[PDB]
Amino acid sequence: AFTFAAFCYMLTLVLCASLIFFVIWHIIAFDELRTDFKNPIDQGNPARARERLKNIERICCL
């Protein structure tokens, strides 16, 4: 029957979706980082270098 442990399990079940969301966000951000890294890292254009650096910083902050 309903008890303290069952309620704990329900609440953890609801809160584990958040952890799944967080890890999915992690892997998406790291896939973007890989797309930036494995792709040529030439920074000849100052604007391109600044944009890439700010993207990296933004993802790290996130």
Binding site: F4, F7, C8, L11, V14, L15
Partner: protein
């Protein structure tokens, strides 16, 4: 019965337990939680956390 003769019992009985009558217990510290079971209180705490 080996030396005298009895009648059929006029009163049957047996061993039993005597206790002091339960009294109005002196109220305990934290008797204000008694209306709800401890499990309800803990579920309340953790529902607060979860919300």
């Amino acid at each position: 019965e080996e030396v005298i003769d009895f009648s059929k019992p006029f009163m049957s009985l047996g061993i039993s337990i005597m206790i002091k009558k339960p009294q109005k217990s002196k109220p305990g510290v934290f008797s204000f939680l008694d209306p709800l079971a401890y499990e309800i209180w803990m579920c309340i705490v953790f529902a607060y956390i979860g919300v």
